[PDB]
Amino acid sequence: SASAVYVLDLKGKVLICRNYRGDVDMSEVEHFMPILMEKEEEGMLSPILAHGGVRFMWIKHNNLYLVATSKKNACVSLVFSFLYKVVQVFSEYFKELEEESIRDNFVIIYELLDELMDFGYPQTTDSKILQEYITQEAPRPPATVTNAVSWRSEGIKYRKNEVFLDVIEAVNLLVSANGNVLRSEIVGSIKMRVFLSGMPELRLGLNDKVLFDNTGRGKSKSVELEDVKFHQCVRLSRFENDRTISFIPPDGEFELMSYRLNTHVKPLIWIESVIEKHSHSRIEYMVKAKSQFKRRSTANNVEIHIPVPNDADSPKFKTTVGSVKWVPENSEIVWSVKSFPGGKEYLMRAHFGLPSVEAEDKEGKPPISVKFEIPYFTTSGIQVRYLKIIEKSGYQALPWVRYITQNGDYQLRTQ
Amino acid sequence: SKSSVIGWPAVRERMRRAEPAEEVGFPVTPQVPLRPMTYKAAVDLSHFLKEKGGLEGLIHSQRRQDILDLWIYHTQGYFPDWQNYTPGPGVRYPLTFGWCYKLVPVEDPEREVLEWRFDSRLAFHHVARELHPEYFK
């Protein structure tokens, strides 16, 4: 129930605003900046602001705060969803998220904002549909929005029907300083870049534990994702009835399904860190990394970030494999490795001095995280069975998909 | 299939060595297609196993079945799930339609000795599907 949504700047100047209900005066945006400054200075800053009886919910964007003033107790979740959709639409239309594009495409920006929502109720949410009706460089509204099938525009013609899938794996490991991993969750991501002719209805099929149990084939390696979320085009009725993933694929790259379940397997990388820091004399970095993944898998672009001292200077690195660079902006040493074969064991020995003057205040102990990304590895063991590509005209599709394993929340608590 | 013929003797020797009763991760070969075995493919595999021997009359074992499924997946990319047996007790019909191999008793269902037997009518009659229509969807 936001009264009006506006785009602000880092200096407090509003890049663009669009009133939807008119129940709140436009001058309330000025008081938002002092309120935000006070909240940040007092630790009471929150995304949902409140200026008296009018709430100005703001979201920190790439360059400006997306302030959405509201008057009544409207759907806060709905307002957040509308703001996220607007951000996604702006990112799709404008490749840059800064003040340069805010003041460069205002003519089309105003039309897009007007078409997006009216009277506080969002109406248009398809980026492709918005581009087919609002362009920066007008015809009647497309019938796809009026029709039920708003996730697959009809009439698409392509020379070849190629779909690029991406099996993105996110391994998040929360290892405490005591050596025990508390939060070990793996989140799947089934994103497909479908580029074909027409609006084929995808018939997803994979080696799911629930599907195998229902079909009686619950004896092989079946992925039992704790949380699986279907895309907009995915038909939830088939999934609820018999796990039938039947939906119209979108024109382009989209995330159809995203698995999310806990992980009970050993970590892909076992990192042992040693802090031989003298009392204002020297610092020791006994970093040992062990690759617990299969030797047949190589972690490309491995970056294990080891936080160095805030006031540390004159550091010397004694490692075996992988370049180590101390970033003054990062104030930490990142164990950069180009390719990390599975089972590799890297030992590092840091040595640097410390200032004679003691620090006035403590800086905390940020966790140590790695940036490993080993593709072509399916740790979960979930294997896609088939993709039912059905077209009324009839064509032979050649879909493609790649499994990518990366390091997500693989943060290890510091000692 | 020269590769399949070459792998048949080693696979049969490994299955015979295993009695009837270390590396982590899930590496995937690059560019190798993965899909379940088809009915025609299952029939062809059953016929090849019957012709080469070592499949009909062999004592059914979990380790032997797993080894055979892994060898089939390595040789042709077929998922090792179509070589399923019908629920017991008694003769376990092929799980995938078109398969010419089935497990039958040779003497609790787990303690019953099972032997793989060729079945031409299995590739044409959905005995497993008829027995368990719910499992077939």
Partner: peptide
Amino acid sequence: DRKGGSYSQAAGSDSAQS
């Protein structure tokens, strides 16, 4: 080639499930 796992051909459905 491409980092993060090469694209592989996908089937249409489970042929062993009828």
